[PDB]
Amino acid sequence: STKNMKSSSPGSSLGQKGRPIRLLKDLSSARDKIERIYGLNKEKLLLLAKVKEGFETSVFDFPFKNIQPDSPYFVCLDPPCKKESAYNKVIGDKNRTVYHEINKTEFENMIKLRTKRLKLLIGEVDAEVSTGDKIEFPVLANGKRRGFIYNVGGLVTDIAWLNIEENTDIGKDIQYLAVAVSQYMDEPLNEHLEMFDKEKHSSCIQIFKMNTSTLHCVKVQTIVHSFGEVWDLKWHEGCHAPHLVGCLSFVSQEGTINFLEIIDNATDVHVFKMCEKPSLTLSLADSLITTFDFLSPTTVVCGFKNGFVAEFDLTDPEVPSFYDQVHDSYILSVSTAYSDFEDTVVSTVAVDGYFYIFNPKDIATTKTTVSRFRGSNLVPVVYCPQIYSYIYSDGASSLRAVPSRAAFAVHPLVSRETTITAIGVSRLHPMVLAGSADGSLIITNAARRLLHGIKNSSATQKSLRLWKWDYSIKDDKYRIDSSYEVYPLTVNDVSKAKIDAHGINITCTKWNETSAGGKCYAFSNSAGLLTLEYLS
Amino acid sequence: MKLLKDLLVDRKEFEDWKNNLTWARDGTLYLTTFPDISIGQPKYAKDINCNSKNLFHVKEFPLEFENKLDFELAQQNGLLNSQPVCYPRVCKPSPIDDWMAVLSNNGNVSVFKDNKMLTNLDSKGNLSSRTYHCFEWNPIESSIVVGNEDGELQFFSIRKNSENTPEFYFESSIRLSDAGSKDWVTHIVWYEDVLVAALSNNSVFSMTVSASSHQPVSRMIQNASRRKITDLKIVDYKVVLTCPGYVHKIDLKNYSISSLKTGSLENFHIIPLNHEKESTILLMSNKTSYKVLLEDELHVTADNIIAPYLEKKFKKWSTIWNEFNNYETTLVIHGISLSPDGYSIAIVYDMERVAFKYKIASEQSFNIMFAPLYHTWTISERAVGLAWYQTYQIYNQSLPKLPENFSMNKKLLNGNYPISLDFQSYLNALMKSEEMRIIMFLNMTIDKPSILSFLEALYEYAINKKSELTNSFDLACVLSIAAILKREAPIYNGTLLMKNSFLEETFNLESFTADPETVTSTTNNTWKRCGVTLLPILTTHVKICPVSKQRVIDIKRDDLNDYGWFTRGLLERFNEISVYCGTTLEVM
Amino acid sequence: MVLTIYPDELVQIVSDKIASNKGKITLNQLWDISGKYFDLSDKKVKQFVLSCVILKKDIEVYCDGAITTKNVTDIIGDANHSYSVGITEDSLWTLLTGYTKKESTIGNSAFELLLEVAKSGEKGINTMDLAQVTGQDPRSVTGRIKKINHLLTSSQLIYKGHVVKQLKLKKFSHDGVDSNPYINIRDHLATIVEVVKRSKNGIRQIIDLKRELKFDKEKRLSKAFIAAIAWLDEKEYLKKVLVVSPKNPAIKIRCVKYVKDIVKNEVLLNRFYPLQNQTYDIADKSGLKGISTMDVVNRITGKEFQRAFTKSSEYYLESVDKQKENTGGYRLFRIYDFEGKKKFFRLFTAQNFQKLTNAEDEISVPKGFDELGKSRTDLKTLNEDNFVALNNTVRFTTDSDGQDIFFWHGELKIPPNSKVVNFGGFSARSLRSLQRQRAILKVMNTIGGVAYLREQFYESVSKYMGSTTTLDKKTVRGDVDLMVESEKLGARTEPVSGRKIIFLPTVGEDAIQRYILKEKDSKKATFTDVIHDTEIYFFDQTEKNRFHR
DNA sequence: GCCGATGAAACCCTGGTTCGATTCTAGGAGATGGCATTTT
DNA sequence: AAAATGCCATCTCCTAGAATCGAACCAGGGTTTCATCGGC
């Protein structure tokens, strides 16, 4: 099949040994492994040395100091959308988002959020929580925890932190969270939630203003819109202007990418708004966009129902830069791997089970297969920038990491009892949140799996259950278990799937990615119980 | 014209959705399937029953890849060596020579003759200079250009070693990208003396390349743009390129640009109609096709050539798989190639429902369709052997246009035999004659192939140098040719001794006059004759003509017989190519 | 005369006889092949002939079955041992299929058939003898033949009373017309009806049409034509009638009369819930009926995802044998069901499955919570206790100038800082078996508790099931055996007819004997409608004479 | 005209064929442990 | 001398593609019953 020849990079340990490397098991030396995966760029290796010393001891939790800019371990790897002020290029007097204000009666005519209170059991507090109420965590066992659970009133399809550090009119401790909410709750096979064809119906995004120090939280806006359900909900961290909270971007069942100006209120008094016309819509004739990511402050890569990929220029959105077939079928997620040391690359995973990485400069000559999965509707992929690795699921109970170069070097991180449904990563630290269909949320350090040898993986790698949702059919009652559970990385583990209450699957989980809030994370189940915890 | 039945290929996959078909000079189809290339090996049958299954045998064509970069760490292109087991991405056969070049997934260009690697192209430099993303063959001479991640073209030329095997050596380079830029060369097209290349920033350059220039001047003919170049072609010194929503024509005499807006954002393949009088192309996508006239302003007309056939095929498929229009459906093209003569087109396609889908390899099938592009054809020197026969079966067995009053009685070079040449130059002069291409094609159309016109051209080189036929094999050969032509022979009486490893057979030279298929030794054993030299075949070490089924003595597996300058010259010159039909000989 | 061929043509001829003899021949068979073409009386020619064959890379020589060292001068001189010639498996695959074993899409079982078809030569082999000789199941043999049929030619034949295909390698295709072309009466029904339709009064003397279409040539074609007229009557494309002669009203002949000539798919899959919960939701909404895997795939994903759905659903669906751990709450059971020939899984939510298997038992109490985790250690304690140190590898230090400098561990002196389901009494392997067993017993109570297990019974059960599909003998006898094991039926052989009788255990011997007595001399083959005072068109003057008499 | 024999038609039985989904098997991938050698 | 590196064997699980198995369906041929013809 294949053979080597002796031409070799200077200063390489691999070059000195001359061993041909085809599999991760061939990298039996820890320096050769790091050198083969990350290369020999001294500035890149310096950042990995800072991640290593700053987070080696952080097996389940990391110190708040190591994510402050004054730390010697501070490594903040800003995503590509943040690298320039995009607002005047992408938006202006030609592209303002149009709203009209509506009252609560007009809202309730368009969107029927849950009216029956949820029964919630947490620690020793048993409570009926109404739609729009929160419960702060009680005096739990297993130490003091800081956070609250909010009853959002519908199926939570996605959430998104606005990762502002400070602004002329936003003080350090204040943060914003966008939550996308469906009225088509409690029904796993509802007709309106279909993936495969264009659907338009009323759904809403709720904007929350939260204080990281007090955990005071206020819903400041509800945006009613007719795009259907929304996901890949992202703030355009480059689009900032004095009169905005920020620019919020998402893909919708309409099959379009939409950008909303979230215009800041005069006061925290709640307003309902009907979105008439977004600032920007990206679409093609006779195909539906199913997923997108930023390549640039002014360009996005997106996946389609038919298995095509396009790039759009946000300054000239009518026609894409390219439109090529990459998959046989519906693209589930597209994810941008960005680096200061390599060309930007894009990963895609589809219902056909293939996971590809390619370079948008030349898809034809760069398309690399990571793996084929068993075929599935739900395959979360995120880029963890501190370890230059995509973190992803099989669509079936295994959580894995693959470096954006060395696609052969797949590292399993943890194995669950059931389908992994949500992954959370940060630009500030290597800690991975993964949510599951059984309502468990786990934390694991991915920079203890990468930045370590191959031998004794199962002994060195661990994860911790931070929370578990349960649902009682007898009581019609949700319970959240605070008690921690440690899982070692399992060996030769059988793929697992089991059926759990429709309400308890974790739909999304996202870290706050700021130095001030960077220990906050949020996660939601399908019932619409949004939980925030300031991890401390 | 009515098409041949499509060649059904089963259980083959493609990694990607670009143009994965090339059609070689000798008629071989190369499909860059995954994980191995597939070859449509050309086959001869007198009746193909209007079925293209009888023109091609499709099989796995495995190749060994040497990664010259597997001890290099990836630098700016992080996807280099990201998957370390090499496999083919692009395969182009030479438009002139027996060999093909393959680009691997890890940016190596390796040249192969049969399954054997000739050279892995490399020159000294930075890793971006050594990582290749495209290549092109010189259409006029034996050389190859590669495009690298420095945005320079590197030219490689052949030289032949002691065994007369080719070796590729680095000749020169031209930088197209700006100094310190990270633009890759993504497309190269070489047409006559004009070379065109595109960068990953979608800037396009032209050059004039010659033996008279070591490093020619490049000119930028299109500025950088976000719109990614889909396809690039040269047609009558007009550059045609496609990108999302547009086709552009650049005139290489005026450097004027004219552009036309397509009603679609699907990829359009460009198919140049090289044999029309007016300068034209077909544009073809999964959804539509057009015929474009490359006038001062691009003019659009209906594709009356190929669209009717694919429409008719899609309506039949739709009747079986998309009754009631319950599904969205598409043609999918996996490859389009002109024939080497440019008279025919091959389209590899399947038809799909847009659906949630999870295929395995055993469920894969695609069809390749062959259609004529014109009303008439000619015996092109851009094609050899079974390529002409394929172009004859397409076109429904209509003969090509031939010279006025041509007949197989016509003498090679019209009887102006270049007897003063050396014998290898002489045989080359005969094989490059126009009459020889016509006769070699017509041998594939008739029941019994004939080489009487070639045997006369040999006999005239044998009654000249009549004093130099000292050798017994050379005499037995010329005496056999004289007996076929019914002419005077140099000597009649004497003996030939011919050997194999088990059995030594003595022939009276007189016996070489008796029978045209056979010759009988002094032991009354009767032996078949060699097709080229008419000497007895005493061995299984032979090569077989796939059309005439004549056997040729394999000079490379016979150390025992003292073949003279004439018989050795014939058996060396005709070791690989059939004198009857120009087809590649099969090996026993 | 000794024929003249090329030496490589001999090696091909010998190879094409090692293939077509199941991959091996004796050395004496090689002398019988090559003696046609070379004078083997010369020792040097005999050595040359053997050398042409055995020095080929893919040919093997065996001495007493053991591979041997190809010494040509030894093999020809050595009288002490038996020699035989074979080929490599990939050569055998290449000669017969055109591809190697790895590359060929044919499959081992279809290649065992091709080896027997190849060994049969120009004589060929029939599909029934082919199944018996290879020991392959007749249920699989014809499906396997479909995948090699491009290598074969075939024609229909009757053998041991069955229509079968004679098979040969395609090289034995003859362009000549068959001496015995197989005729099926069922191909000619349109012609038979049209000849009756075009006849003067739309009526024919049946024997006259039998003679005009020349179906009298074989007792087979006679029976077949009669069965075709009987089928066209039974389906009322034609009708049988008796015509009284207008010339002599004592004369009636069996006649046949003409009567007649012969916006989108919506898929519900969503990206928000796990696929197993979406599957549970339509299994639950289907209720006590359950849902087929075919309907689940059509409604959630469409047919082109069937395989992916099946491979995924294996992880969370439970068969009744080999159940998974009882999580409680939400479980999907699967059981076999039939749609005629197709066997597929129906899916049931565990509540609906319990109501189906155990209809008499109490409906289950709904589950509450599991117990909480009982750990009380905090995150700080767990983080400190679960630390295992990493490999040293990447390091950095801060210079006196405050510049951070990278180094590998050891490259500076700086020290480290670190299987039958009970269904309440009817044992069944499928829901169709359960439905058939209950239909048999309900019919048996209806028709008086005793039945001969003949075709009349299989229609009675098929009618009661509302089955458009008709029950096979082997299917009903399968259910009857299950109903005997569960003591819901009695069954026995009736001594005189040898037919199986089934009876309800509550039905007395006097009723079973009276049932046999009532069934004896039961009248059948009864006369059809009568017609008078009208002409018959005749092909045959002898039939016209018998009507005129 | 009646009764018995033969032939003729209808009905029933048996085995192969046909079809497709599920099941099974083969081959490969991945991980750990153990042992040996190399490097620090 | 100890830790790290390298490679092999064994065990476990997965995936693709082939094989199995039930049931229906169909045709041919045997058997049984009924009708007609011939003989008494």
Residue numbers in the entry:
A (entry chain B): 137 to 672
B (entry chain C): 1 to 588
C (entry chain A): 1 to 262, 322 to 477, 538 to 668
Task: Kindly provide excerpts from the paper associated with this entry.
Specifically, the yeast τB subcomplex includes the N-terminal region of τ138 (aa 1–668), τ91 and τ60. The high resolution of 2.46 Å for the τB–DNA subcomplex facilitated the accurate building of 40 bp (+37 to +76) from the 3′ end of the yeast tRNAHis gene. Unlike in the human counterpart, all WH domains in yeast interact with the downstream region of the tRNAHis gene through base-specific contacts. Specifically, WH2 interacts with the B-box motif through residue R139 contacting C55 on the non-template strand as well as G55 and C56 on the template strand; residue S140 also interacts with C56 on the template strand and residue H162 interacts with G51 on the non-template strand. In WH3, residue K223 forms base-specific hydrogen bonds with G47 on the template strand, a region upstream of the B-box. This interaction is notable as it is the only one among the WH domains in the N-terminus of τ138 that extends outside the B-box. For the WH4 domain, residues R366 and K370 interact with G60 on the template strand, and K400 interacts with T54 on the non-template strand and G55 on the template strand. However, eWH’s residue D591 interacts with C52 on the template strand and K593 interacts with G51 and G52 on the non-template strand. In our τB–DNA structure, subunit τ91 binds to the downstream region of the B-box with residues K591 and N628 making base-specific contacts. Additionally, τ60 in yeast contributes to DNA binding by engaging with the phosphate backbone of the B-box motif through residues R11 and S362.
Transcription of transfer RNA (tRNA) genes by RNA polymerase (Pol) III requires the general transcription factor IIIC (TFIIIC), which recognizes intragenic A-box and B-box DNA motifs of type II gene promoters. Saccharomyces cerevisiae TFIIIC comprises two evolutionarily conserved modules: τA contains the C-terminal region of τ138 and subunits τ131, τ95 and τ55; and τB contains the N-terminal region of τ138 and subunits τ91 and τ60. To adapt to these naturally varying distances, TFIIIC interacts with the A-box and B-box through its two subcomplexes, τA and τB, respectively, which are connected by a flexible linker. Our study addresses this gap by determining cryo-EM structures of the yeast τA and τB subcomplexes bound to A-box and B-box, respectively, in their fully engaged state in complex with a tRNA gene promoter.
